[PDB]
């Protein structure tokens, strides 16, 4: 009895994640879908390299949405460019709903699984995955005939609880009962991170620009005024030094206030801004004549 060891990973290339997130936000009010191109490198790893959007259609995210003419032609044309990958799965967004598969989605997944027993299905909520977090869980139908044996039929391994724990907002929509998640791991490699690092990279000119002194003097004057009032409290807070259980005094007056947090916290800002500005000032005086 073959089994998807929990160690099994669905490798998502740096390309796919941007393209899958892009498609999801493209039609965010509605639901988008497309086939994912990859290889079943072995039992314990389902590698997805590229994804190509299957055009939005009124059916929604269902078997019917998979236009055989569009897919047969697109695959044929991607084979010439140098991407002879096989259809490894399908993905569809879920405008804010979560990372779960509904009844209709399950029927799709069962279809894809018909062609290969490892066709992984993913989600990609473009509304929740709005910050550093990317809500994209992979899923493979756990055939209902394996209720006699162990669901999530894993074997020797120990990465089942790692990288995630069963999310509650999904466990309710059928997990370890009809669909199980597969650990998602991104195959970012050098020569791809470096090109993405340019997204917010500054430039040579930056770092030598001296800020502007009119708002710098105002800023220096502003912060020094604010720190001054914070010293007044520091004097009152210390000069009080009330000893009625001072260890308890230091814990009954914690509100992110005078003593230190609004203290030198500003010193670092004030001193970092000046030192960098000054050093820029003197470097320019040397470099530029």
């Amino acid at each position: 009895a073959p089994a998807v060891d929990t160690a099994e990973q669905v490798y998502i290339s740096s390309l796919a994640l941007l393209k899958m997130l892009k498609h999801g936000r493209a039609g965010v009010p509605m639901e988008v879908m497309g086939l994912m191109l990859g290889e079943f490198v072995d039992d314990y790893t389902v590698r997805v390299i590229d994804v190509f959007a299957m055009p939005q259609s009124g059916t929604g995210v269902s078997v019917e949405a998979v236009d055989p003419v569009f897919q047969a032609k697109m695959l044929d044309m991607l084979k010439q460019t140098g991407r002879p990958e096989m259809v490894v799965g399908w993905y569809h967004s879920h405008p804010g709903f979560g990372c779960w598969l509904s009844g209709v989605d399950i029927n799709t997944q069962q279809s894809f699984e018909a062609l290969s027993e490892r066709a992984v299905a993913v989600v990609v909520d473009p509304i929740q995955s709005v910050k550093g977090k990317v809500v994209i869980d992979a899923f493979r139908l756990i055939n209902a005939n394996m209720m006699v044996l162990g669901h999530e039929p894993r074997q020797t391994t120990s990465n089942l609880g790692h990288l995630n724990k069963p999310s509650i907002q999904a466990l309710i929509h059928g997990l370890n009962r009809h669909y199980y998640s597969i650990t998602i791991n991104y195959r970012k490699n050098e020569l791809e991170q470096k090109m993405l690092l340019n997204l917010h990279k500054k430039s040579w000119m930056e770092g030598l620009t001296l800020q502007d002194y009119s708002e710098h003097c105002k800023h220096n004057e502003s912060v020094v005024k604010e720190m001054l009032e914070l010293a007044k409290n520091y004097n009152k807070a210390v000069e009080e030094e009330d000893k009625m259980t001072p260890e308890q005094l230091a814990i009954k007056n914690v509100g992110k206030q005078d003593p230190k947090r609004h203290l030198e916290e500003h010193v670092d800002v004030l001193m970092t801004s000046n030192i960098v500005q000054c050093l820029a000032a003197m470097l320019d005086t040397v470099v530029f004549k």
């Binding site: 892009k22 709005v130 090109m195 340019n198 000119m205 770092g207 010193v267 000046n274």
Partner: protein, 286 residues
């Protein structure tokens, strides 16, 4: 004219994929593709791309083939997937332009008149900005010189729309620098700037040497612009500025001094509070 060609992160991450697709087996030079994107007032937005079978020969530098039907059919599919994209130019990862660029650009002019070619130096990972955007202009060169095709330059800048931005930020998530900067990173921002300004000035010197040694044609234009930069220098030695610099340097030191003192009194107060803490616990142990 196109003021800017903002290349989204996804394109340079598909081109990298496109270079790897082929170079891995069919070792070859630049990989050519089509660049889709939405227009703006004047800033062309590059939002996606795809590959086009392109084969070239080092002989005659005009035995090439950029497939037409593949370009036509591909876009036929993509306008179905997303309709805000129109063909807007091409990309090739060969760092140095070829003699075939003009002729091929004329082709892509058949699909978008204001076609901009964006050279993505996929192989290099260096000072930065791995995109260089070019247009096609045919002018009489005002100043009495032969006419020709030539590629004019258009300012390139790499930006990100919201969706790709979220993916990219997580995609690094292991080498991203703190946005606050802090003293450590701010200073490195300047050793980095000095290295560039030298590097840019050294490219200028080599070219000036080339024109000086004749190996290159005196542009007669942009050549004196470099002369413009050479007059825009500050001349700091001026007394009236020398006084005004010490005042602001002195204006700041009195703030770093006040900053320094506060951090010192806080330091001593923290040792006195701590000296009491361990001592009091010292006696209290008995």
């Amino acid at each position: 004219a196109v003021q800017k060609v903002v290349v989204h992160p996804l394109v340079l991450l598909s081109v990298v994929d496109h270079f790897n697709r082929i170079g891995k087996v069919g070792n070859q030079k630049r990989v050519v593709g089509v660049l889709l994107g939405s227009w703006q007032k004047k800033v062309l937005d590059v939002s996606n791309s795809f590959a086009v079978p392109f084969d070239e020969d080092d002989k005659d530098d005009s035995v090439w083939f950029l497939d037409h039907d593949y370009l036509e059919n591909m876009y036929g599919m993509f306008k179905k997937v997303n309709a805000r994209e129109r063909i807007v130019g091409w990309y090739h990862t060969g760092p140095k332009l070829h003699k075939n660029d003009i002729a091929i650009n004329e082709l892509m002019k058949r699909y978008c008149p204001n076609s901009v070619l964006v050279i993505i130096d996929v192989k290099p990972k260096d000072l930065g900005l791995p995109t260089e955007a070019y247009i096609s202009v045919e002018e009489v060169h005002d100043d009495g010189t032969p006419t020709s095709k030539t590629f004019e330059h258009v300012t390139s800048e790499i930006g990100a729309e919201e969706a790709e931005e979220v993916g990219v930020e997580h995609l690094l998530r292991d080498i991203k620098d703190t946005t606050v900067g802090t003293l450590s990173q701010r200073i490195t921002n300047q050793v980095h700037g000095l290295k560039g300004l030298n590097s840019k000035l050294l490219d200028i010197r080599s070219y000036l040497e080339k024109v000086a040694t004749g190996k290159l044609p005196i542009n007669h234009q942009i050549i004196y612009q470099l002369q413009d930069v050479f007059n825009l220098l500050p001349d700091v030695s001026l007394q009236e500025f020398v006084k005004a610099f010490y005042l602001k340097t002195n204006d700041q030191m009195v703030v770093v001094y006040l900053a320094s003192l506060i951090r010192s009194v806080v330091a001593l107060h923290n040792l006195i509070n701590n000296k009491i803490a361990n001592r009091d616990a010292e006696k209290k142990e008995g």
